[PDB]
Amino acid sequence: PSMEDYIKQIYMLIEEKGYARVSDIAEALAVHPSSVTKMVQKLDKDEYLIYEGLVLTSKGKKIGKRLVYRHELLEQFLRIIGVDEEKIYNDVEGIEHHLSWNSIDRIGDLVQYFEEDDARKKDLKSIQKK
Amino acid sequence: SMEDYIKQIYMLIEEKGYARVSDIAEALAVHPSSVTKMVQKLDKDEYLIYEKYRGLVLTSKGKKIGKRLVYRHELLEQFLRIIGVDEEKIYNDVEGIEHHLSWNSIDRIGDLVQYFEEDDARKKDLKSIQKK
């Protein structure tokens, strides 16, 4: 996992629980608590959080939210265009790490496009016939 | 990487009608010796048929894979252009994601690309949203 994966996961946990425990972060990212500990120190150095209990700072809360928004919007993207639910998670991860923010912005517009008229998704599904 | 070679070999043949080891080394920007190591793997694995002094031909199996690969790359380029991603950001973007998407996703991105190519109004509608 990268720094963004961590901040994202930490924010996800605080969203769901009100706290981000080392053991939960480790468990969620499938890494050892010892690795979480190093990363959490490097994140504290970077002012995303303050570690002693771990606590997101305002920079932490703001960026985490962007990263979750992004992830979920990308998931909605793949769902809307008819990708099989089982592959969606792996595809979104594999590409939030690789696509420019400009490309994300444009994908967001595309999701907006399909939300603006149900006739659009119907027509697209017709193509998925082949 | 076997995949990138098959793709590259495929592209050279589509382009020039033939693919030689040195054509491949210049294309992939790798050392000739690296090409040779991979070509033996490809030949023994029946992806291509190589003869010294003759360059190489893809088997029906290698052609299948090369064609599908180039399709994936080209498609991803067209997808990002169609949705209006900055021209200069496109290459680094496709490169980065092309090895990290289920073929299921690729397939659906293909229908999406088809969808916008079918009708000018759809492109017009999409662009309207980008302008905000």
From Swiss-Prot, chain B:
A Pfam entry, by short name: Fe_dep_repr_C
InterPro entries reported for this sequence: DtxR_MntR_Metal-Reg, Fe_dep_repressor, Fe_dep_repressor_sf, HTH_DTXR, HTH_tscrpt_reg_MntR, Iron_dep_repressor, WH-like_DNA-bd_sf, WH_DNA-bd_sf
Effect in UniProt of substituting H73A: Retains selectivity for activation by Mn(2+) and Cd(2+) over Co(2+) and Fe(2+). Can bind Mn(2+) in the C site, despite alteration to the A site, and adopt active DNA-binding conformations
Disruption phenotype: Null mutant is very sensitive to manganese. Mutant also displays increased sensitivity to cadmium.
Transcription regulation listed as a keyword: yes
Binding sites annotated in the UniProt record for Mn(2+) 2: K7, H73, E95, E98
Chief subcellular location: cytoplasm
Intrachain S-S bonds: none
Keyword rRNA processing: no
Record remark on domains: Contains an N-terminal DNA-binding domain and a C-terminal dimerization domain. Contains two metal binding sites per subunit, site A (corresponding to metal ion 2) and site C (corresponding to metal ion 1), which both contribute to the metal selectivity of MntR. A large metal cation is needed at the A site to correctly orient and position the C site ligands. Smaller, non-cognate metal cations bind at the A site, but disrupt the C site, blocking the full activation of MntR. Binding at the C site also favors Mn(2+) and Cd(2+) over other metals.
Family stated for the protein in its record: Belongs to the DtxR/MntR family.
Protein name: HTH-type transcriptional regulator MntR
Organism: Bacillus subtilis (strain 168)
Lineage of origin: Bacteria, Bacillati, Bacillota, Bacilli, Bacillales
Underlying gene: mntR
